[PDB]
Amino acid sequence: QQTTLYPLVGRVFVHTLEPASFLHLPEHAAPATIPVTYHAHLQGHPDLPRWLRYTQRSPHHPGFLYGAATPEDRGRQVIEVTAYNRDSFDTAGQSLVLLIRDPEGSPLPYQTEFLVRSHDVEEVLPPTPASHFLTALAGLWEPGELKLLNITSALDRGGRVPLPIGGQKEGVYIKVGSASPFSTCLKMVASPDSHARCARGQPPLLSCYDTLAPHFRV
Amino acid sequence: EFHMGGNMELKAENSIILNGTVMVSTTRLPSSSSADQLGGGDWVRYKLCMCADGTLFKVQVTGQNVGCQVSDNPCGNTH
Amino acid sequence: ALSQMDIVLHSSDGTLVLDAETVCLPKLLQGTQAASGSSQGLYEICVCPDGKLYLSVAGAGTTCQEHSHICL
Amino acid sequence: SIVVEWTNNTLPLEPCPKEQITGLSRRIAEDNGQPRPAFTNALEPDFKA
Amino acid sequence: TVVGIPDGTAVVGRSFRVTIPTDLIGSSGEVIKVSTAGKEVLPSWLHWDPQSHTLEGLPLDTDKGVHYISVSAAQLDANGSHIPQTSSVFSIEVYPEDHSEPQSVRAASPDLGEAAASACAAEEPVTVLTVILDADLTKMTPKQRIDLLHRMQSFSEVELHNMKLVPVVNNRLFDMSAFMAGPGNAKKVVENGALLSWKLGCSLNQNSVPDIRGVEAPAREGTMSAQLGYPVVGWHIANKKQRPELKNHIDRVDAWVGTYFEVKIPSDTFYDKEDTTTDKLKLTLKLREQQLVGEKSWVQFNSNSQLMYGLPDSSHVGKHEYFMHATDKGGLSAVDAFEIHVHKRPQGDKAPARFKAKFVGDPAPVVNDIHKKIALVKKLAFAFGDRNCSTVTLQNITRG
Amino acid sequence: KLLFSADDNEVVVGAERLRVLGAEGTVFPKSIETPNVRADPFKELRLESPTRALVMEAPKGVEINAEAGNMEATCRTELRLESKDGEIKLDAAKIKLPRLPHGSYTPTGTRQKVFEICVCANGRLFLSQAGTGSTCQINTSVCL
Ligand SMILES: *[C@@H]1O[C@H](CO)[C@@H](O[C@@H]2O[C@H](CO)[C@@H](O[C@@H]3O[C@H](CO)[C@@H](O)[C@H](O)[C@@H]3O)[C@H](O)[C@H]2NC(C)=O)[C@H](O)[C@H]1NC(C)=O
Ligand SMILES: *[C@@H]1O[C@H](CO)[C@@H](O[C@@H]2O[C@H](CO)[C@@H](O[C@@H]3O[C@H](CO)[C@@H](O)[C@H](O)[C@@H]3O)[C@H](O)[C@H]2NC(C)=O)[C@H](O)[C@H]1NC(C)=O
Ligand SMILES: *[C@@H]1O[C@H](CO)[C@@H](O[C@@H]2O[C@H](CO)[C@@H](O[C@@H]3O[C@H](CO)[C@@H](O)[C@H](O)[C@@H]3O)[C@H](O)[C@H]2NC(C)=O)[C@H](O)[C@H]1NC(C)=O
Ligand SMILES: *[C@@H]1O[C@H](CO)[C@@H](O[C@@H]2O[C@H](CO)[C@@H](O[C@@H]3O[C@H](CO)[C@@H](O)[C@H](O)[C@@H]3O)[C@H](O)[C@H]2NC(C)=O)[C@H](O)[C@H]1NC(C)=O
Ligand SMILES: *[C@@H]1O[C@H](CO)[C@@H](O)[C@H](O)[C@H]1NC(C)=O
């Protein structure tokens, strides 16, 4: 069993993973009950390349393979992945084929990096919350198309473990690219007066209403 | 598996927990036959007994009809 | 195998065969036999002929022999 | 006797900081080598250089 | 085999306990899993004990309603699965204080409960003794609520089902209608409080109250609070009409020979449900077999200042290990481990400056005492007027 | 001091340290002989097989030590503690048996010779044939 995917240099790639067809042994009745983890590596290697990484909140939750293609990794790439069921101890070897190619269309020089504090990484990884976040960002990106570039756990950059009391989330760093120029509100956000205010703990000078609210806290 | 040649040592500070449907090697463990007529009669030997909270405790046996009922509970009062 | 904390021999739903000539349990709590019962939930440990271990309700005398249904 | 030796971390392993050491000598030391009144007061009373 | 577990009834403040017939639901090797129907978490007022296979709890005022409980017997699979072969679902209905006496509650028991079956008249007020404690039922587990109930049982001589444990409403820590009252052993109140109440009789007067010395005396002397585990605010008779947790570790401590280092623990290093802060919790430093640092050791640590400090020597270059122990007011300790790397002085021998001085008196007590060494280092730092005493690196001391 | 050699068996390089780059890992088709495997600081240690068995041997002893932690022996079929001629002990203040199943009573069931546990004075345990009453006062030669 193999599957061929088509990543491109410049933007993120994410693969939602379902135990229904990934595992050769079907999970009948309610398939969401069984906890299965996944260990993915380069073929004949113990770990994924630098650009690619893998996460999983809980074994009773789907894992996620995600990363941004690099121009130095262009070409054919082989992923050998093992579905280790946390309960059933059932080995399901699987091959994934990646063809890292150049992006098609205009580039996105205008990249923007944000920190989300109201959500975990595994919440944004499904396509629909990411789409909702990108539409909310387009609510302030008028005009211009959007395309996410990078997703990274805030704990990877060096953040501390949030307190489990108070609903505190780990946070996530998000890079989204666009060829459209930044908005005037975004231009005044980056002004050093707001940086000085943030250094004092004062709020940054905001002229546009937070479209991310109340779902997303940035 | 744990295949050791000599003794196997399992030491803890607070407590041990053996969670599961435990078996035992009956042939390997010795069993006291009743051929001898009370060779260990009125002897200080303890019987293992089950607390309500999973704890085990040993009760000294005085006569032939000593059960596991206790008044001064070493398990602690079942709070 | 010594540990500074609790040790969990967590067989989820399986069996635990302990194959040794001698089993030493020198650190058990000592119980005092009396007619009065401190509380309920008191049981005694019972052995099936195949090595299966179970429990019976504690009483004035032994109750392992009265509860031989589980042994098969 | 207590024969004490030490080094300073701001020393950059570079061409001689002779001006810094001269300033320290005129600040806390003297040409004869006795502890200065400020240096002695800092040393006072546990240590007597 | 489908097993029909009967529906259960619980009352706010009353101890609910049900025995699940696990022998019928689960076969040999099958282990029961008890949760909420369609959820992986039981309700916050319920606790399942696999030892006696018993679901017991105490519902609070926020737990009113019908709680559906799913009981599924997982079966052993050769490869490793645990298949819930038989899933039995039963509902538990929670009633407010408007529920009747536990006589209606005690509806599933061979015992008649004549003591419980005795009641008062419809117009006769019920004489109830209520003990006020300094505890929060929300922060306490239902297991801890049953703990409190059965610990008060040892002084009240009353069964668990006849007691009522409720939170204090509107910060009322005294009853004005009580004809008898007594102070507790708690001089201050931290939590909101808990009222644990049990009936003594029907409209009893002062001359008709039974012997309550075994309740009044231990509460005043504090032995009742010692056995309960929580402070006792007081008691009155009226005629009513955890272990700390860890989030962040200390990776390693970078130190250099002849250099003084000082580290203050972060405020988010450890957490407890009862404390929530590191500063309000006792912190100690220990060795591998739980021995403290000696007075002569090159690293010490002050608990009141929650500050570790030290200055290493070249005979102690390399790795070392230490444990941080975080003990709360509850007598429970959380543990973190950390490693310290001590390096040689990076500048080494090519330092552009070399200060040398000879003093008076034997250097044996000064070298033998790390306190004298750190005092000397900070005294040089103050002599230069400096704040960071680490800028001094002693290199060698010789007896003269 | 030897700083390089390359002969018919092997090649010795006397470098102070061996420093490999690359986050993808490495492959050593034959073996690694290291006297001391140490975890990276601030990092976990993991000894796993992706799809197969793990076997580990030491004829002169194995010390598993949790200097502050737990020994979570999570299995699903058998936690075999098989000693050839030694013994097993559980040095702990309390002993828990949280999931030993109950045995329903047989007032008239078939007579099956169940067994009971008798404790010697040194904590040594031995079996005994169940009788009408407690039968842990028959023999002391096992305890002797
Ligand atoms: C998306 O974000 C990730 C995470 O920040 C980026 O991956 C990071 O990329 C940098 C540089 O490419 C890596 O730094 C390198 O680290 C190695 C040591 O492993 C060091 O030897 C090099 O000199 C360099 O400093 C970093 O390790 C890597 N982190 C992870 C977790 O992969 C990624 O580049 C970002 N991609 C885009 C398109 O923004
Ligand atoms: C010993 O291991 C067994 C195997 O897991 C445990 O048995 C069952 O374990 C599951 C998973 O923990 C329990 O389900 C959970 O129950 C709790 C309340 O007990 C509930 O809050 C969770 O949402 C979840 O449903 C299940 O109850 C339990 N059942 C039985 C009969 O054991 C067992 O708990 C373990 N015992 C110890 C002392 O570790
Ligand atoms: C090692 O020698 C250096 C000398 O280079 C010592 O550092 C010096 O520390 C003093 C503070 O006591 C610094 O004084 C400065 O004064 C200016 C005046 O405006 C002020 O702006 C600064 O904030 C500071 O107060 C001095 O600059 C600094 N020398 C430097 C940085 O080169 C150091 O304390 C010695 N360490 C020992 C003896 O352990
Ligand atoms: C720092 O102070 C130390 C100790 O006062 C000095 O090291 C000492 O150096 C002398 C001169 O060699 C050693 O004396 C002889 O050493 C040989 C071995 O090298 C030994 O076999 C002889 O019996 C005799 O002791 C002395 O042992 C040594 N002390 C030590 C190593 O503890 C050092 O020279 C001083 N350095 C500076 C820069 O002041
Ligand atoms: C004191 O010196 C240390 C060097 O170890 C440096 O890290 C620290 O910033 C200095 N203190 C101040 C106030 O600059």
Among F78, A154, A34, E381, residue whose Cα is nearest residue C12: F78
Distance, CA of F5 to chain centre: 42
Resolution in A: 4.3
What are the tokens at F21?
A: 């780059």
Query: Is the omega angle on the peptide bond into residue E244 within 30 degrees of 0, that is, cis?
Result: no
Length of chain D: 49
Query: Which pairing describes strands C7-8 and B15-17: parallel, antiparallel, or unpaired?
Result: parallel
E255: CA distance to ligand 4 center in Å? 25
**Residue E226, SS3?**
helix
Q: Least CA distance to F76: which residue of chain E?
A: E80
Report the 3 state secondary structure along A22-88. Answer: HCCCCCCCCHHHCCEEEEEEECCCCCCCCCEEEECCCCCCCCEEEEEECHHHCEEEEEEEEEEECCC
CB E105, CB E160: distance < 8 Å: no
CA distance, residue F46 to nearest chain A CA (Å) = 12
- Asked if F25 lies within 8 A of A46 by C-beta distance, the reply is yes
Q: Alpha carbon F109 to chain centroid distance?
A: 40
| Residue indicated by tokens 């699940």 | E20
Q: Note whether E212 and E178 are within 8 A (CB).
A: no
For residue E55, the cross-strand partners are E18, E48
Look at residues E248, E198, F3 and name the one whose alpha carbon lies nearest to residue A160. Answer: E248
Find the helix packing angle between E142-156 and E213-221, rounded to 10°.
120
Tell me which residue has its CA closest to atom 28 in ligand 1: A50
**Burial A61-80, CB ≥16 within 10 A → b, else e:** ebbbbbbbbeeebeeebebb
**C64 has a chain B CB within 8 A of its CB:** no
Measured CA to CA, the distance from residue A39 to residue A82 in angstroms comes to: 5
For residues E225 and E223, give the distance between their C-alpha atoms in angstroms, rounded to a whole number.
5
Tokens standing for residue E194: 């808990």
- Cβ pair A206, A187 in contact under 8 A: no
| Per-residue CA distances from E20 to E3, E110, E261, F96 (Å) | 10, 16, 59, 21
- Which residues does a 6 A CB cutoff place in the pocket of ligand 5? E 387-388, 390-391
Identify whether the C-beta of residue B70 lies closer than 8 Å to the C-beta of residue B59.
yes
Cα D9 to Cα D19: distance, rounded to the nearest angstrom:
16
Name the token pair of E225. Answer: 């609070």
User: Of E177, E180, E183, E239, which is closest to residue E207 (Cα–Cα)?
Assistant: E180
Going from the C-alpha of A193 to that of each of A110, A197, A201, D26, E388, the distances in angstroms are 22, 6, 12, 45, 33
Structure tokens at A53: 């990484």
From the CB of C38, is ligand 2 less than 6 Å away?
A: no
HEC readout, chain B:
CEEECCCEEEECCCEEECCCEECCCCCCCCEECCCCCCCCCCCCEEEEEECCCCEEEEEEECCCCCCCCECCCCCCCCC
Q: In A104-174, which residue ranges form alpha helices assigned H by DSSP?
A: 121-124, 127-138, 154-157
Which-ligand-closest: CA of D39? 3
Question: Rounded to the nearest whole angstrom, what is the distance from the C-alpha of residue A120 to the centroid of ligand 1?
Answer: 21
Cα E16 off chain centre by: 23
- Size (chain E), residues: 400
Among E192, E180, E162, E191, CA closest to E219: E180
Residue with tokens 């999970």: A27
In the β-sheet with E333-343, what is the strand arrangement from edge to edge? E252-256, E333-343, E318-327, E282-286
Instruction: Single out the residue of E52, E17, F99 nearest to residue B52, CA to CA.
Output: E52
Helices (H), D1-49: 18-28, 37-43
Q: Do F102 and E51 touch (CB under 8 A)?
A: no
Q: Edge-to-edge strands of the sheet including B2-4?
A: B2-4, F81-83, C18-19
Output the six-digit token pair for D22. 């001269």
Chain E residues within 8 Å of chain D (Cβ atoms): 258-259, 345, 347, 350-363, 366, 375-376, 379-380, 382-384, 390-400
**Beta partners for E358?**
D3
d(CA B37, CA F82) in angstroms, rounded, equals 34
